[PDB]
Amino acid sequence: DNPLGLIDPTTISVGTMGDAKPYAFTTADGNFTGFDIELFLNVAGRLGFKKEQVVFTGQEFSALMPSVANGRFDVAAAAIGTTAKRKETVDFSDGYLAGFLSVLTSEAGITDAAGLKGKRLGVVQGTLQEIYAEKNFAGTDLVKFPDNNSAVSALNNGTVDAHFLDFEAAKDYSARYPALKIAVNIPSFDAPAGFVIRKGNDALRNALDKGLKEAMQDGTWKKLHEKWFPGTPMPAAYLPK
Ligand SMILES: NC(=O)CC[C@H](NC[C@@]1(O)OC[C@@H](O)[C@@H](O)[C@@H]1O)C(=O)O
Hints:
Elements: E1 12-16, E2 19-20, E3 24-26, E4 32-33, H1 35-46, E5 54-58, H2 61-69, E6 75-76, H3 84-87, E7 91-92, E8 100-105, E9 120-124, H4 128-136, E10 141-145, H5 148-156, E11 162-166, H6 167-176, E12 181-187, E13 196-197, H7 202-217, H8 220-228
Parallel strand pairs: 1-5, 1-6, 9-10, 9-11
Antiparallel strand pairs: 2-3, 3-4, 6-13, 7-13, 8-11, 8-12
Helix pairs in contact: 1-7, 1-8
The structure holds Deoxyfructosylglutamine.
Deoxyfructosylglutamine binds near residues 17, 79, 98 and 127.
């Protein structure tokens, strides 16, 4: 009666974020939107779940995987990079996005990674950016923030020199706050975004993988990517055939 092993067989409960625009964010009415959200919804329709049967709940990034592991949500979707470390806690669907980690700075700020020595760099707790910075930015003071909004506020108030976040979100903040610019782009192609599910929920993982493959094959993935990330390169792996 519950082949997908959901908390409630009538609905899919998804954990996401309100401040990861354009991957996942809320409209002014509060409804979730963004690339990951519209992609998940299109995948869910293929699983037999209409938009009205999918509930989105925003949390701080660090709460998402533990919330899935503890059975608070059926899935998490928020540009969650697939890593061996994370696979110890949750299971992942096939990948659906591979891009860059970006250092966002002010108008007269840092111009390269070496320029980060002796600087204050914002990072969101639990992100791949925090891991990358601790491994490759020795000598940079890392300032932990619960979300991007608080970190960008600190950057704008001059209390951090830069913020480390996902490329598309850095690009969006650079448009909202025109003085801000992307100083450094770090590849993160080895940690493609995947939907996160409870370890062992093979039925749901298999179903999301099938829907993702179908969405990529019929050009839905491409359409959503062109809508939400205009100008960003799309790899053949996620495009038709
Ligand atoms: N919502 C967030 O804050 C996510 C931050 C960060 N995302 C990295 C990533 O998955 O973002 C989408 C793609 O660019 C991936 O290559 C990348 O590893 C992470 O997973 O930790």
